[PDB]
Design a protein around this ligand. Structure first.
Ligand SMILES: [Mg+2]
Ligand SMILES: [Zn+2]
Ligand SMILES: [Zn+2]
Lengths: 76, 280, 152, 258, 48, 56, 94, 65
């Protein structure tokens, strides 16, 4: 009975909300030189978070080059 | 420096301003399980289960303890320890640096605990130069994070040859109503020019008018303002600027300890959702 | 103002969508420029704060004038793709051109925009009344008369 | 035309007046002196023993902060690419006492600590400290340890103090007390702002109408001081030669476009 | 594995094995706390 | 069409991007190095759309 | 120092100058502004962190001279002025 | 811990002048005249000598080997 109910119970806090993958958190500092629809991301976060991309005809070259860059250079 | 952010000089930082060090002590114990099976300190051979990469145990002496003044960078083993397989193998239960941290080993202590077994404590120190996101605060409640680090030649300079160490935004003074900060700014420069410290007691301290008169007597404007020249253009600003000496403190909320990222990671048992906490 | 955030130690979370449909939804529905108008009162929310307003006042205040180098430098810094400076407004001593702040600001506005209102700095209602009479008499009064009866 | 007049020459500083150049040139000279003029400074330290109360990363910083003399004839300090010549500084200390900068030994006689009375660390009884510091040429823009001093300038202005003010005698006395030159004339006293001159609170009312300040065009009062790494005249000449070299390199690269 | 361990209190050069030792003590002052001294290898630290 | 609401445009672009990623050919020449999603936006802006929307 | 032409057409030239900062950029621009045939000229640093060493320039002339010739004139004037100041300083200091 | 080698703001070497200043001001001399005599003129330098506290002496007792 107590397992289901409560803020930390099953019904709420476990299906309603949960920990998620592909996320980061850090402090914020101002920067007026970027557009209002842009966010400055640390290079360290970019190396960790990833976006799966399917290899098609028009992006084979870029993806091949970035695979060649490996996981230690930035555009990799 | 908008919205309670501050601008800090780069040359001043490179000369030893607000530079700090961070210590953290790790601890390992040679537990003595019932029945005679006990842990031991050693270099884990590749045979054992849970044996991580060979590069992780790269600066441990043959007794299983790390060398002082060696460089660790995260997930590196500090004390090599193998546990009995009892939940022909040997579980690996080494104590390693936190995954996101880094530093240098400072001291290693070998003790005999209360129960008679062994106990080892290792402390790793890390240098923390100020950077973007580090939090600073004054005694009058003004808080902020470093917004930008500026080269010295780009900083303005007063007509008497003073280059500011730190720049704050004029919009933070009203609606915060901290005239004490301005009084302290006047008093700091008065004290530095006069060669004696200034009493600032709660109700019997030196009155403001005396400080302004003394500042006037030393060749500066009573208002505390000065004439500066712009760093880039090289010509003087239209308005004279307020400048003084204020006591600032570096807080322990530093960005190197708050950044956190998660791509895949491990999961819990019951819910199989991602774990909670930066450490894991 | 949307996030209600200040740079005094606040922390924020970043999420990276992984599927193409999620990326398309984030790109089309939740772009920042799509949420300039607030859905609570129908007015703008993403606007200037603090130094933007104060510097705007300093730039377009009465009596503000800027030299050639300042005009070119600020126009390049803003990013405006201008190619030739407008005709100088006032010639100061030593024969140097000067440009009023209003011209520099107007270089940033669309070509066909007409609006008039009273801002917070109004303190002499008589000047605003006279200006309103001039505008209301004919909807396009001659610019020189309006410059004659200008008032912050 | 261009001319230079020198007001005061101390041992480690010089204050001269530059006349006939635009503000941009003066700012360029100041920034070039601050950031482009190269000097020698410690870069890496190889510790063998360190039993002092201070960490390795603190003694390394203190060693970096020490100013080292720089020869002028041996190297071409005005070039746009710097030499990689390396000078080794060694030290061995033990026992109670204070380790001073004068105890450092150098491979090259031309490069050595300027001030032999800078304390480095306080060694207690039994504590030892041995290392081998490495110094190399570097520019002030990369790190502040390479800065060859400190430079600033100001406008050359004259303050007009009309004699209609009832108490101009007090203003003249204050100006002479400060040390600025005073040139008395009928109906107005002329004060040359060699050093900043802020008028007191009582006379603040007369500012503008009676006390008004004029700016002599294209004239600046420079102040250059050094920590002993280089003579001041060498610093100024090196900065000017660096500017000439940069102009020539820009000419070459621009011509490469045609 | 024989190794050198400085004492915590008197700072004496105590050398003894630890894997086989059952009772750990400094043979001079009886202290149960020892240090592991820094090695004699050259460490290189950037003077930044 | 008559008028595309925000949700319909987002849905169409997402479906086209998914189809392009899974192997469908692109009916508009595109610059090299573009992601499938931005190819979908370029295709929508050109006006060639092969997906229609059903209204009640 | 490197020159990367952003765009060149008619009497307009826009280019990056890799390896430089305000120190030489401001001096070059202020020397250029003295030329009567230069209608517009300015420089900017796009970002204080990422583009700290990559100022971006813009030069527009009236067609009497090409921009790459006005730049040559400005650089030659800068060199001559620096040489004159150096000679004056050498004479004065000793 | 110990006196800084250079002034944080302008960079003038003031590391060697702390002990002389302390002795002179303790003897009874006016601190302002002592600071003027040492050559420190801008108040950024004077602040570093005035507000410095010597803490290397009372942390030297605890040794770590
Ligand atoms: Mg907050
Ligand atoms: Zn002992
Ligand atoms: Zn100073």
């Amino acid at each position: 009975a107590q397992r289901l109910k409560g803020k930390e119970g099953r019904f709420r806090g476990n299906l309603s909300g949960k920990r998620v993958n592909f996320s980061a958190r850090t402090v914020i500092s101002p920067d007026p030189m970027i557009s209002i629809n842009e966010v400055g991301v640390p290079v360290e976060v970019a190396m960790e978070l990833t976006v799966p991309e399917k290899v098609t005809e028009f992006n084979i070259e870029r993806l091949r080059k970035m695979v060649l860059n490996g996981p230690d250079k930035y555009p990799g | 420096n908008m919205e309670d952010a501050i601008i800090i000089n780069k040359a001043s930082i490179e000369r030893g301003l607000a530079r700090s060090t961070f210590f953290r002590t790790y601890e390992a114990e040679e537990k003595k399980y019932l029945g005679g099976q006990t842990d031991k300190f050693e270099i884990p051979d590749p045979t054992v289960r849970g044996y991580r990469g060979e590069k992780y145990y790269r600066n441990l002496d043959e007794d299983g303890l790390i060398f002082p003044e060696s460089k660790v960078e995260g997930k590196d083993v500090l004390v090599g320890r193998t546990s009995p397989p009892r939940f022909q193998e040997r579980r690996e239960t080494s104590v390693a640096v936190r995954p996101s941290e880094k530093g240098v080993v400072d001291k290693v202590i070998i003790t005999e605990t209360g129960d008679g077994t062994k106990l080892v404590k290792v402390t790793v120190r890390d240098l923390r130069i100020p950077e973007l996101g580090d939090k600073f605060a004054s005694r009058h409640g003004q808080k902020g994070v470093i917004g930008l680090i500026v080269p010295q030649e780009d900083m303005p300079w007063t007509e008497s040859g003073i280059v500011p160490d730190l720049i704050v935004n004029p919009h933070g003074i009203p609606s915060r109503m901290t005239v004490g900060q301005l009084i302290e700014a006047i008093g700091g420069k008065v004290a530095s020019l006069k060669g004696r410290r200034v009493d600032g007691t709660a109700f019997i301290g030196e009155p403001e008018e005396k400080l302004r008169k003394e500042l006037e007597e030393l060749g500066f404007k009573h208002t505390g303002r000065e004439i500066m020249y712009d760093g880039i253009t090289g010509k003087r600003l239209e308005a004279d600027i307020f400048i003084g000496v204020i006591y600032y403190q570096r807080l322990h909320h530093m960005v190197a300890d708050k950044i956190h990222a998660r791509s895949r990671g491990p999961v819990q048992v019951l819910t199989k959702q991602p774990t909670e906490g930066r450490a894991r | 103002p949307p996030y209600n955030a200040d740079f005094d130690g606040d922390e924020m979370n970043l999420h990276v969508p992984q599927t193409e449909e999620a990326q398309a939804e984030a790109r089309i529905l939740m772009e920042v420029q799509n949420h300039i108008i607030s859905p609570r009162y129908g007015g703008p929310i993403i606007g200037g704060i603090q130094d933007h307003i104060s510097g705007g006042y300093l730039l377009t205040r009465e009596g503000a004038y800027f030299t050639r180098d300042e005009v070119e430098q600020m126009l390049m810094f803003a990013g405006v793709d201008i190619t030739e400076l407008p005709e100088p407004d006032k010639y100061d001593e030593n024969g140097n051109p000067l440009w009023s702040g209003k011209t520099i600001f107007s270089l940033l506005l669309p070509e066909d925009l007409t609006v008039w209102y009273r801002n917070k700095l109004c303190d002499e209602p008589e000047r605003c009344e006279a200006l309103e009479k001039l505008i209301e008499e004919k909807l396009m009064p001659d610019p020189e008369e309006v410059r004659k009866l200008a008032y912050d | 035309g261009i001319e230079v007049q020198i007001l005061e020459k101390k041992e480690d500083s010089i204050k001269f007046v530059l006349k006939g150049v635009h503000v941009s040139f003066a700012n360029a000279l100041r920034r070039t002196i601050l950031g482009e003029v190269p000097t020698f400074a410690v870069d890496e330290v190889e510790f063998y023993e360190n039993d002092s109360a201070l960490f390795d990363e603190i003694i390394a910083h203190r060693l970096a902060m020490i100013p080292l003399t720089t020869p002028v004839d041996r190297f071409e300090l005005d070039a746009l690419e710097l030499d990689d010549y390396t000078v080794t500084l060694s030290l061995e200390a033990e026992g109670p006492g204070i380790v001073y900068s004068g105890d450092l030994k150098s491979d090259d006689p031309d490069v050595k600590p300027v001030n032999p009375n800078i304390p480095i660390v306080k060694l207690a009884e039994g504590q030892r400290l041995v290392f081998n510091a490495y110094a190399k040429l570097g520019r002030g823009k990369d790190h502040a340890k390479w800065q060859p001093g400190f430079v600033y300038y100001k406008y050359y202005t004259i303050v007009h103090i009309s004699k209609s003010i009832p108490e101009w005698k007090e203003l003249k006395k204050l100006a002479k007390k400060r040390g600025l030159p005073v040139e008395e004339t009928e109906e107005e006293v002329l004060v040359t702002t060699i050093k900043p001159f802020y008028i007191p609170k009582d006379f603040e009312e007369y500012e503008g109408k009676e006390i008004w300040e004029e700016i002599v065009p294209n004239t600046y009062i420079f102040t250059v001081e050094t920590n002993g790494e280089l003579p001041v005249e060498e610093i100024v000449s090196i900065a000017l030669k660096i500017l000439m070299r940069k102009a020539d390199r820009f000419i070459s690269e621009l011509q490469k476009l045609t | 594995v024989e190794a050198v361990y400085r004492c915590f209190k008197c700072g004496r050069e105590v050398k003894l094995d630890l894997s086989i030792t059952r009772d750990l003590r400094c043979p001079y002052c009886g202290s149960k706390i020892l240090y592991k001294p820094r090695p004699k290898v050259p460490r290189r630290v950037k003077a930044i | 069409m008559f008028k595309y609401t925000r949700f319909e445009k987002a849905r169409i672009i997402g479906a086209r991007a998914l189809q392009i990623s899974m192997g469908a050919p692109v009916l508009i020449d595109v610059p090299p190095g573009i992601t499938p999603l931005e190819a979908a936006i370029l295709e929508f802006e050109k006006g060639v759309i092969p997906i229609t929307v059903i209204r009640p | 120092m490197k020159i990367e032409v952003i765009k060149k057409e008619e009497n307009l030239l826009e280019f990056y100058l890799e390896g430089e900062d305000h120190t030489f950029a401001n001096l070059l621009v202020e020397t250029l502004r003295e030329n009567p045939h230069v209608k517009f000229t300015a420089y900017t640093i796009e970002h204080p962190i990422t583009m700290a060493r990559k100022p971006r320039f813009r030069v527009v002339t009236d067609g009497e001279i090409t921009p790459e010739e006005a730049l040559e004139e400005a650089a030659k004037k800068i060199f001559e002025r620096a040489k004159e100041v150096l000679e004056a300083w050498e004479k004065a200091v000793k | 811990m110990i006196v800084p080698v250079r002034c944080f703001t302008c960079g003038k070497v003031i590391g060697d002048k702390y002990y002389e200043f302390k002795r002179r001001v303790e003897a009874g001399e006016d601190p302002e005249k002592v600071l003027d005599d040492l050559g420190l003129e801008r108040y950024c330098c004077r602040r570093m000598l005035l507000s410095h506290v010597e803490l290397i002496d009372d942390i030297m007792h605890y040794r770590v080997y």
